[PDB]
Amino acid sequence: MVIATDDLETTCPNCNGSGREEPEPCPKCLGKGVILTAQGSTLLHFIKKHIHE
Amino acid sequence: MVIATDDLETTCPNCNGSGREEPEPCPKCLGKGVILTAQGSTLLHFIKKHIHE
Amino acid sequence: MVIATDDLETTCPNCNGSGREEPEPCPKCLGKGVILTAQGSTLLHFIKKHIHE
Amino acid sequence: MVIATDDLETTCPNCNGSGREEPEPCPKCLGKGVILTAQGSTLLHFIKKHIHE
Amino acid sequence: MVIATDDLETTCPNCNGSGREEPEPCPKCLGKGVILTAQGSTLLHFIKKHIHE
Amino acid sequence: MVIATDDLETTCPNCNGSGREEPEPCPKCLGKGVILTAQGSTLLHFIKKHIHE
Amino acid sequence: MVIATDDLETTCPNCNGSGREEPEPCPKCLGKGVILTAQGSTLLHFIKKHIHE
Amino acid sequence: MVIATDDLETTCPNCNGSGREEPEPCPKCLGKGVILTAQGSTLLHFIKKHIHE
Amino acid sequence: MVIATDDLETTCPNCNGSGREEPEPCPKCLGKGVILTAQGSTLLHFIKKHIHE
Amino acid sequence: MVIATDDLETTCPNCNGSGREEPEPCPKCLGKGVILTAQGSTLLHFIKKHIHE
Amino acid sequence: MVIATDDLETTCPNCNGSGREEPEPCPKCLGKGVILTAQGSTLLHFIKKHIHE
Amino acid sequence: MVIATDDLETTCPNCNGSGREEPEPCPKCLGKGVILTAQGSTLLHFIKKHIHE
Ligand SMILES: [Zn+2]
Ligand SMILES: [Zn+2]
Ligand SMILES: [Zn+2]
Ligand SMILES: [Zn+2]
Ligand SMILES: [Zn+2]
Ligand SMILES: [Zn+2]
Ligand SMILES: [Zn+2]
Ligand SMILES: [Zn+2]
Ligand SMILES: [Zn+2]
Ligand SMILES: [Zn+2]
Ligand SMILES: [Zn+2]
Ligand SMILES: [Zn+2]
């Protein structure tokens, strides 16, 4: 596909995907285990920007 | 465009797009008349995954 | 790759991929277990139209 | 990236991006300063169409 | 195709595509009924810059 | 769609659809009323070279 | 490349290259020996529409 | 072009082009002198799967 | 954007923008201070071949 | 361009781009200030694997 | 991902992974068990031509 | 292909191919006869940044 999950987010380098920095959630990916790529933030920002017009 | 509606969803083969399997909604596309392609589910999943962070 | 399998066809929602509706091939995907995306139909259609040339 | 902000929306020609047609918001981009391209409306429509299934 | 018309220009929001603001051509789209996307401007700009070569 | 029908074949210039040439079949497009593009010819030559017939 | 010459024009099916139909330029191609693809036509029509001329 | 012959098949590493391993056709390429790329294999497998034959 | 400005033209090596060569105009880029890429040259040669001038 | 920098790597979330975790290079991005996307790893990996050939 | 690993290299036909040929190393793929594609060969030849070593 | 040599480097405008400016290698191209495109520069800079060397 043109845009796959891997094009939108990548495994967080801090928790290596666990979402954890024990005993707390991982601060770098705020618990998700992944961080957004520029393409993912572009798409997310766009949707949030216009979803409720 | 890079991603058109047709790249994101296709007409449901069960109801041929009607969203109906009379007398009930069509079960395969749960009433929408279309089903998601891998590219559409990837995009939808991504948005739902991060929209409320 | 530019056009991967998932860009061409998607799991049939009627048989969820088995290609079967016992005792018959699944009629929605013609026993293939997948339905074509618009890009897949476009390609199949073109090859078929010009196969003898 | 495959789809950048500029592929999804363009500066509104009426307010040149200000979101204003003084003393009121700009009517053409309904206050946002940008209007959607076909690719942006396709993506937005798709998300709104399936986000709550 | 890789770059379709809709990738290049989008219906002008001021005249909704007529190209008119009677009695004049619509000033926002220069009577064209469409405004350029960034990709359209990029292309037009390049051709114009090197047209005599 | 990256590869559309019109990117694989372009309407025949010697006819324009009727795919004919009164009273026999059109020579240029063998009656199909469309000719192949470099992309279309490329795909077809490949499939035919390997479908191993 | 994204858009190659091959993406923009095809070998004319009437003169096949020369663009000649003796003793005159090939009518179908205007002597050029090539006809436009849908991509070629889209880009050219775009430029023609806004080039100013 | 989106998909060029080069995208679909490579020079066979056993006969390097000829597809021959004297006195017989090259086993690895079936004499064709080329082996398939993952893109080639995806498209061919697609067509084979639905061509009906 | 699939095709950006910098994919159509790359800064001239003999000058670097001033598009000059004291006291006359820069030879390599004819004063435009940018030279064409294969993509840029491709597009321009096509437009010029068909704009029919 | 088809693959831009942002398609290859994204600001490291641990050092926010400085490449530093004083007094050391940031261990998460190896002092680079960026982490690779899947496309970036794929490319780096391929070049490295075949660098001596 | 536009360019995946399998688009840069395709499994060697003379071995299939072991990257060997008992008792020495595989000749065709020099022990790497994968050969280069036009895309992969293209990228590698470019990097090597400019990395200036 | 996605990225062709033509996408990565252009004919040098100082020596036009040879990369020579007698009796020395062409300064602009380092004798290579080609200069980098923005795409070439992006990919090379990427590899250089992480190759380790
Ligand atoms: Zn984390
Ligand atoms: Zn249905
Ligand atoms: Zn089925
Ligand atoms: Zn506005
Ligand atoms: Zn207007
Ligand atoms: Zn005809
Ligand atoms: Zn002709
Ligand atoms: Zn062979
Ligand atoms: Zn210059
Ligand atoms: Zn870091
Ligand atoms: Zn081998
Ligand atoms: Zn030079």
Author numbering:
A (entry chain D), B (entry chain D), C (entry chain A), D (entry chain D), E (entry chain A), F (entry chain C), ...: 1 to 53
Question: What's written in the study?
Answer:
In Bacillus subtilis tryptophan biosynthesis is regulated by two proteins, the trp RNA-binding attenuation protein (TRAP) and Anti-TRAP (AT), which are involved in sensing levels of free tryptophan and uncharged tryptophanyl transfer RNA (tRNATrp), respectively. AT antagonises TRAP action by binding to tryptophan-activated TRAP and preventing its interaction with the leader region of the trp mRNA. Binding of zinc ion is essential for formation of AT oligomers and for its function. Here, we report two crystal structures of Bacillus licheniformis AT, which shares 66% sequence identity with B. subtilis AT.
The low-pH crystals belong to the space group H3 with four AT monomers per asymmetric unit whereas the high-pH crystals belong to the space group P21 and contain 48 AT monomers in the asymmetric part. Packing of the trimer and the additional AT subunit around the crystallographic 3-fold axis generates four AT trimers that form a dodecameric particle. The architecture of this dodecamer is identical to the one observed for B. subtilis AT at pH 6.5. As with B. subtilis AT, trimer–trimer association within the B. licheniformis dodecamer is maintained mainly by hydrophobic interactions in two regions. The first is a hydrophobic area in the centre of the molecule, lined by residues 1–3 from all 12 AT monomers. The second region of stabilising interactions includes van der Waals contacts between pairs of adjacent zinc-binding domains formed along the 2-fold molecular axes by residues Pro13 and Ile35. An interesting feature of the low-pH dodecamer is the relatively large internal chamber inside the multimeric assembly, which is centred at the intersection of symmetry axes and is isolated from the solvent. There are no peaks in the electron density maps inside the chamber suggesting that it is filled by disordered crystallisation buffer components or solvent. Its inner surface is lined by the side chains of twelve Val2 residues, this amino acid is strictly conserved in AT proteins. The chamber could be fitted with a sphere of ∼11 Å in diameter, potentially permitting the accommodation of a relatively large ligand. The calculated pKa value for the amino group of Met1 is 7.1. This indicates that the salt bridge formation is favoured in case of the low-pH crystal form (pH 6.0) as the amino group of Met1 is likely to be protonated.
